[PDB]
């Protein structure tokens, strides 16, 4: 289809070793959390458990595509 | 000599070898025989 | 040589297959039928 073409065009000449704007400006990352549960707070080992859905979002000007679909929703494969 | 002969033999065996398919994939079932040499039964926990 | 045909089948199935895309990404909704067989209900 067309989503495969979009994904293959985004990853051509792409270097996942370099952050976006590697010599321009810092990358702004917006972070959200969703606490599923805060586990047992045992004082013996001075720790506590927590389960979260950690979400980060930023801007990568290399993953910019022109198409009639607005968002690519993917797995952990990419 | 005797080493490169076995090397080419194993390379011939493994060239065009589909690991996704069992022996006789569309045929009769393959027989697998089991052996077990028990070294220790460590801890039987109730 | 009844092993080459199934290899060609499996290679044609995977020729141009993109496992980053769910089946029916642009036309329908992927409907997964689930099943659970509990072999042992643990402690």
UniProtKB/Swiss-Prot annotation, chain A:
Post-translational modification: Palmitoylated by ZDHHC3/GODZ; required for the accumulation of GABA(A) receptors at the postsynaptic membrane of inhibitory GABAergic synapses.
Glycosylation sites: 66
Effect of residue 16 to S: Found in a patient with generalized tonic-clonic seizures
Subcellular location: Postsynaptic cell membrane; Cell membrane; Cell projection, Dendrite; Cytoplasmic vesicle membrane
Description of its domains: The extracellular domain contributes to synaptic contact formation. GABAARs subunits share a common topological structure: a peptide sequence made up of a long extracellular N-terminal, four transmembrane domains, intracellular or cytoplasmic domain located between the third and the fourth transmembrane domains.
Similarity-based family: Belongs to the ligand-gated ion channel (TC 1.A.9) family. Gamma-aminobutyric acid receptor (TC 1.A.9.5) subfamily. GABRG2 sub-subfamily.
Role noted for this protein: Gamma subunit of the heteropentameric ligand-gated chloride channel gated by gamma-aminobutyric acid (GABA), a major inhibitory neurotransmitter in the brain. GABA-gated chloride channels, also named GABA(A) receptors (GABAAR), consist of five subunits arranged around a central pore and contain GABA active binding site(s) located at the alpha and beta subunit interface(s). When activated by GABA, GABAARs selectively allow the flow of chloride anions across the cell membrane down their electrochemical gradient.
Protein name: Gamma-aminobutyric acid receptor subunit gamma-2
Species whose genome carries this gene: Homo sapiens
Residues of the full protein shown: 64 to 141 of 475
From Swiss-Prot, chain B:
Tissue expression from the record: Isoform 1 and isoform 2 show reduced expression in schizophrenic brain. Isoform 3 shows increased expression in schizophrenic and bipolar disorder brains while isoform 4 shows reduced expression.
Top-rank taxon: Eukaryota
UniProt subcellular location: Postsynaptic cell membrane; Cell membrane; Cytoplasmic vesicle membrane
Carbohydrate attachment residues: 2
Function: Beta subunit of the heteropentameric ligand-gated chloride channel gated by gamma-aminobutyric acid (GABA), a major inhibitory neurotransmitter in the brain. GABA-gated chloride channels, also named GABA(A) receptors (GABAAR), consist of five subunits arranged around a central pore and contain GABA active binding site(s) located at the alpha and beta subunit interface(s). When activated by GABA, GABAARs selectively allow the flow of chloride anions across the cell membrane down their electrochemical gradient.
Assembly and oligomerization: Heteropentamer, formed by a combination of alpha (GABRA1-6), beta (GABRB1-3), gamma (GABRG1-3), delta (GABRD), epsilon (GABRE), rho (GABRR1-3), pi (GABRP) and theta (GABRQ) chains, each subunit exhibiting distinct physiological and pharmacological properties. Interacts with UBQLN1. May interact with KIF21B. Identified in a complex of 720 kDa composed of LHFPL4, NLGN2, GABRA1, GABRB2, GABRG2 and GABRB3.
Disease per record: Epileptic encephalopathy, infantile or early childhood, 2: A form of epileptic encephalopathy, a heterogeneous group of severe childhood onset epilepsies characterized by refractory seizures, neurodevelopmental impairment, and poor prognosis. Development is normal prior to seizure onset, after which cognitive and motor delays become apparent. IECEE2 is an autosomal dominant condition with variable age at seizure onset, ranging from early infancy to 6 years.
Encoding gene (name): GABRB2
UniProtKB/Swiss-Prot annotation, chain C:
Residues that carry a glycan: 2
Positions in coiled-coil regions: none
Any further remark recorded for this protein: Functions as a receptor for diazepines and various anesthetics, such as pentobarbital; these are bound at a separate allosteric effector binding site.
Domain statement: The extracellular domain contributes to synaptic contact formation. The GABA-binding pockets are located at the interface between neighboring alpha and beta subunits.
Function: Alpha subunit of the heteropentameric ligand-gated chloride channel gated by Gamma-aminobutyric acid (GABA), a major inhibitory neurotransmitter in the brain. GABA-gated chloride channels, also named GABA(A) receptors (GABAAR), consist of five subunits arranged around a central pore and contain GABA active binding site(s) located at the alpha and beta subunit interface(s). When activated by GABA, GABAARs selectively allow the flow of chloride anions across the cell membrane down their electrochemical gradient. Alpha-1/GABRA1-containing GABAARs are largely synaptic.
Family stated for the protein in its record: Belongs to the ligand-gated ion channel (TC 1.A.9) family. Gamma-aminobutyric acid receptor (TC 1.A.9.5) subfamily. GABRA1 sub-subfamily.
Name of the protein in question: Gamma-aminobutyric acid receptor subunit alpha-1
Organism of derivation: Homo sapiens
Gene that specifies this protein: GABRA1
Residues of the whole record sequence present: 37 to 79 of 456
């Amino acid at each position: 289809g067309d989503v495969t073409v979009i994904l293959n065009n985004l990853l051509e000449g792409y270097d996942n070793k370099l952050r976006p704007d590697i010599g321009v400006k810092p990358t702004l990352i917006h972070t959200d959390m969703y606490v599923n549960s805060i586990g047992p707070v045992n004082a013996i080992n001075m720790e506590y458990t927590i389960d979260i859905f950690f979400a980060q979002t930023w801007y990568d000007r290399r993953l910019k595509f022109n198409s009639t679909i607005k968002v690519l929703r993917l797995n952990s494969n990419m | 000599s005797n080493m490169s002969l076995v090397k080419e033999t194993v390379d011939r065996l493994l060239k065009g070898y589909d690991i996704r398919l069992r022996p006789d994939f569309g045929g009769p079932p393959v027989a697998v025989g089991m052996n077990i040499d028990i070294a220790s039964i460590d801890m039987v926990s109730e | 040589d009844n092993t080459t045909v199934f290899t060609r089948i499996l290679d044609r199935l995977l020729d141009g297959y993109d496992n980053r895309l769910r089946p029916g990404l642009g036309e329908r909704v992927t409907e997964v039928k689930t099943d659970i067989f509990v072999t042992s209900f643990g402690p």
